[PDB]
Scaffold this motif. Sequence first.
Motif, PDB file in Angstrom:
ATOM      1  N   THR A 195      18.008 -16.646  48.154  1.00  0.00           N
ATOM      2  CA  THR A 195      16.882 -15.724  48.401  1.00  0.00           C
ATOM      3  C   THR A 195      16.577 -15.751  49.871  1.00  0.00           C
ATOM      4  OG1 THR A 195      14.716 -15.030  47.575  1.00  0.00           O
ATOM      5  CG2 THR A 195      15.051 -17.374  47.969  1.00  0.00           C
ATOM      6  N   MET A 196      16.187 -14.606  50.399  1.00  0.00           N
ATOM      7  CA  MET A 196      16.027 -14.489  51.884  1.00  0.00           C
ATOM      8  C   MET A 196      14.598 -14.751  52.337  1.00  0.00           C
ATOM      9  SD  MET A 196      18.780 -13.763  53.639  1.00  0.00           S
ATOM     10  CE  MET A 196      18.194 -12.891  55.080  1.00  0.00           C
ATOM     11  N   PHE A 214      13.349 -13.649  55.221  1.00  0.00           N
ATOM     12  CA  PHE A 214      12.829 -12.541  55.943  1.00  0.00           C
ATOM     13  C   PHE A 214      13.598 -11.282  55.474  1.00  0.00           C
ATOM     14  CE2 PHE A 214      15.935 -11.474  59.351  1.00  0.00           C
ATOM     15  CZ  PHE A 214      16.807 -12.509  59.260  1.00  0.00           C
ATOM     16  N   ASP A 215      13.084 -10.136  55.872  1.00  0.00           N
ATOM     17  CA  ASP A 215      13.692  -8.854  55.425  1.00  0.00           C
ATOM     18  C   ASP A 215      14.511  -8.249  56.617  1.00  0.00           C
ATOM     19  OD1 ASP A 215      14.288  -6.361  54.489  1.00  0.00           O
ATOM     20  OD2 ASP A 215      12.161  -5.699  54.257  1.00  0.00           O
ATOM     21  N   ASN A 239      15.885  -5.481  56.752  1.00  0.00           N
ATOM     22  CA  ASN A 239      15.697  -4.043  56.958  1.00  0.00           C
ATOM     23  C   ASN A 239      14.551  -3.735  57.890  1.00  0.00           C
ATOM     24  OD1 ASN A 239      17.354  -2.705  54.757  1.00  0.00           O
ATOM     25  ND2 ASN A 239      16.372  -4.340  53.642  1.00  0.00           N
ATOM     26  N   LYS A 240      13.694  -4.669  58.187  1.00  0.00           N
ATOM     27  CA  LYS A 240      12.639  -4.425  59.192  1.00  0.00           C
ATOM     28  C   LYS A 240      13.260  -4.547  60.574  1.00  0.00           C
ATOM     29  CE  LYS A 240       8.426  -5.348  58.218  1.00  0.00           C
ATOM     30  NZ  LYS A 240       7.032  -5.434  57.610  1.00  0.00           N
ATOM     31  N   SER A 287      24.001  -4.434  54.017  1.00  0.00           N
ATOM     32  CA  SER A 287      24.236  -4.514  52.579  1.00  0.00           C
ATOM     33  C   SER A 287      25.420  -5.364  52.183  1.00  0.00           C
ATOM     34  CB  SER A 287      24.381  -3.119  51.930  1.00  0.00           C
ATOM     35  OG  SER A 287      25.537  -2.467  52.482  1.00  0.00           O
ATOM     36  N   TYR A 345       8.634  -9.450  63.200  1.00  0.00           N
ATOM     37  CA  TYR A 345       8.823  -8.046  63.019  1.00  0.00           C
ATOM     38  C   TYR A 345       8.175  -7.287  64.145  1.00  0.00           C
ATOM     39  CZ  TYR A 345      10.003  -9.552  58.253  1.00  0.00           C
ATOM     40  OH  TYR A 345      10.528 -10.157  57.138  1.00  0.00           O
TER      41      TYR A 345
END
Length: 128
Positions: free
Chosen positions: A35-36, A38-39, A41-42, A101, A126
């Motif tokens: 599980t990550m 941070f994201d 995609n931001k 991805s 971010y």
Amino acid sequence: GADIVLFSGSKHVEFTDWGGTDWPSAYELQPPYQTMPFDLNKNFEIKVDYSGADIVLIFARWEHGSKPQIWAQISPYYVVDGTAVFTKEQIAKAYGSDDFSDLDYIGVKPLPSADGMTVTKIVASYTS
Ligand SMILES: OC[C@H]1O[C@@H](O[C@H]2[C@H](O)[C@@H](O)[C@H](O[C@H]3[C@H](O)[C@@H](O)[C@H](O[C@H]4[C@H](O)[C@@H](O)[C@H](O)O[C@@H]4CO)O[C@@H]3CO)O[C@@H]2CO)[C@H](O)[C@@H](O)[C@@H]1O
């Protein structure tokens, strides 16, 4: 203001020369398996507080079928004081796209040094 701490402490990595193509790390993630924190995609920056050696950030995709291995080895966008900054835009240019991805691996690694590298903090933040 919403920084994510990926690590804080005192992690020491010994790595005195290239020798093998075994290459120790200060920090690693494998997005397909963990599980990550941070994201991706931001619009993000990763900031590392370190000393003792020069530092790189790796984003990698293993070879799969007819899509080649990507080994995006990135120098800091800049260093200030004792902190290296890496930005999403820089990472995406080295990875070949901003589409994560298929990202297999994220690693923070030292270049060779006599004393070894010590990382005391890794932060994702971010940005605009
Ligand atoms: O599916 C395959 C398997 O991959 C494993 O990872 C391997 C990569 O496959 C392998 O290509 C690789 O990478 C580095 C190498 O370790 C570095 O030494 C090199 O660095 C340069 C350096 O920047 C130069 O300045 C210096 O002079 O020499 C060195 C060259 O020796 O760049 C290559 C790029 O590949 O090592 C990876 C170790 O993991 C995964 O572990 C496994 O899970 C995957 O299944």
